[PDB]
Design a protein around this ligand. Structure first.
Ligand code: THM
Ligand code: THM
Lengths: 290, 291
């Protein structure tokens, strides 16, 4: 399924990455991509790309392919692209539209998107990696909702469960310093109110109403909460690709709302999804091991 | 009025996305004089605007980031003005709004004006035009921000500070800008492509005829530009006791096309136009002390 309007453009400008289809030979430059790793932080995804380059035995600079005034960054290491997506579904959708167009022009088929994020845990210890087995909205429905030309639309979320299972198996054969849990993930459209936090600038609910909401989620198999999953796992399916979420937790929301861990520990925890996924990528031809 | 009663339960409040806490500073002394908060989606752009304001104010030393080095957002202060970025989209803007309005509360600030200095798609105006929003609406043309809280739909009305908008239009007639300034309505959308009626995304479920009927309808309802944050900014500030305006430049006329074809340099130049107008407004309305 290709957007029939694209070929009618003489040049396609990737506004948020600061380049166009005339900037590179897309087939030659990107044609070998089979994985796209993304997260909300430019610095974090940059450091992950560097880590993958070192695992690949690459001794050459990991250069940002995006323009200097672009909203997003983009790196390539062997068969993996790395991009940030900011925070929230709308921002993620911008990256998704532009990256999936890039893959199309490059002739890349059936690529795996991997979101390496952070999240609020539900009933798990901070620092736990959650492999999402479903991505749902705040009503626990496996759909991303959109309003297109002012009309409501919904798109089903589909996680690549085969890959989730491979990652769980891998974690069982590695010596990790954290637990790896497979469970459901809520995507919310704010950090505070929609996530049931009492510590925002506005709160219209009681602690009892909050607990009921979070306990219900937990009983329905939810183990973490973040802000992008329903976009990533609905969009990729519809453009012919696969997606997974691999997110660490930074707080147990059944215990509190504030992120009280140190900045150093948060950064450490945030690198854990990459620890697991990096080994997976090394074993599954994401990088060439030199 | 109206403060979140739960905040008094905290001995320390951690502003996660700014990388500091209520114990990092004496908030009343540090931020108590703030009367303006200027925001946009780009950290680089808002930093550069803060630098320009510091220069207008006669300040020599560089403008330093107040946010932690590993924070999601940046934060600057020049005299009575705070400057922050907000990323792209309502959810990202709401994170900024919650943390900044909490900051203002702890600092004892009242009736602050938030000014979003953004970029946008124009509807029937030339690229490079500054649009002063006189209302912010969703993609259904309703002046409400929609939320889903504990899984239940909530709607919050949007309110623009029209008196200030009128003051800015009047100011623009007294300045020598490279552009025109238009007052009109602004749609906030939850994506850049499909929700904005663009034909050039990775997915498109509609025709050009359908795109134009949508945008024509919007234009007929007084809409002159389209962006991704306005309904959050203008509903949240009202509820927390503050005021808000949007001052956005256009980078394309969406009635003619979707692609941003102007050069990257010219886009950056256009994006400085809201600050050109707003900076002079701040100079004239005690945002800075002129030394
Ligand atoms: C710790 C945490 C992270 N996140 C994720 C998703 C966002 O992209 C970003 C917001 O802090 O990090 C949450 O949504 N909720 C949380 O409680
Ligand atoms: C030019 C343009 C900018 N924007 C704004 C709002 C977002 O914060 C960011 C997205 O590019 O810039 C639009 O939403 N639509 C547009 O057509």
């Amino acid at each position: 399924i290709v957007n029939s309007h694209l070929s009618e453009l003489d040049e396609d400008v990737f506004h948020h990455f600061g380049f166009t289809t005339k900037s590179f030979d897309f087939k030659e430059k990107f044609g070998d991509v089979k994985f796209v790793c993304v997260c909300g932080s430019s610095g974090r995804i940059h450091n992950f790309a560097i880590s993958m380059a070192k695992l690949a035995g690459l001794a050459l600079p990991v250069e940002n392919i995006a323009g200097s005034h672009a909203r997003f960054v983009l790196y390539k290491v062997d068969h993996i692209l790395f991009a940030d997506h900011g925070m929230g579904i709308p921002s993620a959708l911008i990256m998704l539209h532009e990256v999936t167009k890039l893959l199309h022009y490059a002739g890349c088929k059936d690529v795996l998107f991997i979101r390496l994020g952070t999240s609020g845990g539900l009933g798990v210890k901070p620092g736990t990696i959650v492999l999402s087995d479903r991505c749902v909205n705040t009503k626990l429905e496996p759909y991303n909702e959109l309003c297109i030309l002012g009309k409501p639309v919904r798109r089903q979320t589909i996680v690549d469960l085969n890959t989730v299972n491979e990652l769980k198996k891998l974690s069982e054969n590695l010596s990790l310093e954290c637990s790896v849990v497979v469970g459901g993930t809520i995507a919310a459209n704010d950090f505070y109110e929609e996530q049931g936090r009492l510590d925002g600038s506005i709160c219209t609910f009681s602690k009892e109403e909050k607990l009921a909401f979070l306990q219900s989620a937990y009983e329905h198999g939810i183990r973490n909460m973040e802000m992008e999953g329903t976009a990533i796992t609905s969009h990729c399916y519809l453009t012919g690709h696969r997606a997974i979420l691999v997110c660490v937790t930074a707080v147990n929301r059944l215990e509190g709302d504030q992120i009280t861990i140190s900045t150093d520990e948060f950064t450490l925890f945030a690198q854990r999804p990459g620890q697991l996924v990096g080994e997976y990528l090394k074993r599954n031809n994401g990088i060439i091991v030199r």
